[PDB]
Design a protein around this nucleic acid. Structure first.
Ligand SMILES: Nc1ccn([C@H]2C[C@H](O)[C@@H](COP(=O)(O)NP(=O)(O)OP(=O)(O)O)O2)c(=O)n1
Ligand SMILES: [Mn+2]
Ligand SMILES: [Mn+2]
Ligand code: NA
Ligand code: NA
Length: 325
DNA sequence: CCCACGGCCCATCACC
DNA sequence: GGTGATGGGC
DNA sequence: GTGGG
């Protein structure tokens, strides 16, 4: 909340570049600037002060100057008033509609929730589910409900096979009081980086959760990755909101790089890979690998904790609750 | 000045 | 029909 | 939009 007025401006500018301009690198630029400003311990009094930070350059500093002088930014006013940009920005709030589809709809004169209902025939399955649960999907999930969800997922997973390990990651694991969705990491001793020892590994768990009517809809489903919709049961009382759930099956011998990754935050992961590279390592969601002189990655290093990955790249260990960058 | 900007799974659509 | 191309998501 | 090169 120290520099919240600035980070809101930068976030809104970022979304505009992603959704409307389709400039993904500008989007990331703004997001980067917002994050670096966000973990800055003094409250910014001028743009030149902010320009000291990496990620904040000339253009953003100007915008910070204009904002601190007037409490708003003209560029954002023009954007909000512009009706095509407005329409396109809104449609992307529907799951399954990205910058491309949103722009295509608006060009056809389709630019509201009602217009989407009226033209439902033009939506794919994903976009239809997103439209259906539009309100629910923009609701935060209180941590109290996450724990109820966690209990159910962990248990039904046990009911299929007790050797399964299901770990809730994401913002939940970072100890957030509310989450946008539920992220589940799944492993089994059969599945390592050396085979396909079980087929239907992810299917069994998905199917079991559908059977107890916890999972209600499927957005996508393959052999290692499920993207879908879930809902808590009601005791008798108003229904719980339908929630987004992601399930990711990962080789058991790569569990810790997996849980590090799926815990996030997404920007923290960009920071960690960025530092890891300066220290002669390449990290992804699966492994950490050393680099030779030529910039050629060796074979995966041994990992048996999250702290192990931190030690290689010589970072002091940070609790998941301190990765919300 | 100029360019690189963590990446891969899954669904669908254009094209043959 | 099978594909390669692309979008959307994490 | 930014910073390293
Ligand atoms: N581009 C991306 C997208 C996601 N991720 C990782 C880090 C995230 O913590 C994890 C899950 O993403 P997520 O569910 O969209 N957001 P996250 O759980 O961190 O916070 P919420 O908005 O869900 O409450 O995937 C990433 O590293 N790079
Ligand atoms: Mn999440
Ligand atoms: Mn998620
Ligand atoms: Na700077
Ligand atoms: Na969307």
């Amino acid at each position: 909340t120290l520099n919240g007025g600035i980070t809101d401006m930068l976030t809104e500018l970022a979304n505009f570049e992603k959704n409307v301009s389709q400039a993904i690198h500008k989007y990331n630029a703004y997001r980067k600037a917002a994050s670096v400003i966000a973990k800055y311990p003094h409250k910014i009094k001028s743009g030149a002060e902010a320009k000291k930070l990496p990620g904040v350059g000339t253009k953003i500093a100007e915008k910070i100057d204009e904002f601190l002088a007037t409490g708003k930014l003209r560029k954002l006013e023009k954007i909000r008033q512009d009706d095509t940009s407005s329409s396109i920005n809104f449609l992307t709030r529907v799951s399954g509609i990205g910058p491309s589809a949103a722009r295509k709809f608006v060009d056809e004169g389709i630019k509201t929730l009602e217009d989407l209902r009226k033209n439902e025939d033009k939506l794919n399955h994903h976009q239809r589910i997103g439209l259906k649960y539009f309100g629910d999907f923009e609701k935060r999930i209180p941590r109290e409900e996450m724990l109820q969800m966690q209990d159910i997922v962990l248990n039904e997973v046990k009911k299929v096979d007790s050797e399964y390990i299901a770990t809730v990651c994401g913002s939940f694991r970072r100890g957030a009081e509310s989450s946008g969705d539920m992220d589940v990491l799944l492993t089994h001793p059969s599945f390592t980086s050396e085979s396909t020892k079980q087929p239907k590994l992810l299917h069994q768990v998905v199917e079991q959760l559908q059977k107890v009517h916890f999972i209600t809809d499927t957005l996508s489903k393959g052999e290692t990755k499920f993207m879908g919709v879930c809902q808590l049961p009601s005791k008798n009382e108003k229904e719980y909101p339908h929630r987004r759930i992601d399930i990711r099956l990962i080789p058991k011998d790569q569990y810790y790089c997996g849980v590090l990754y799926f815990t996030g935050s997404d920007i923290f992961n960009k920071n960690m890979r960025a530092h890891a590279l300066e220290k002669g390592f390449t990290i992804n969601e699966y492994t950490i690998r050393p680099l030779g002189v030529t910039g050629v990655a060796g074979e995966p290093l041994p990992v048996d904790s999250e702290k192990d990955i931190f030690d290689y790249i010589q970072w002091k260990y940070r609790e998941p609750k301190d990765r919300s960058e």
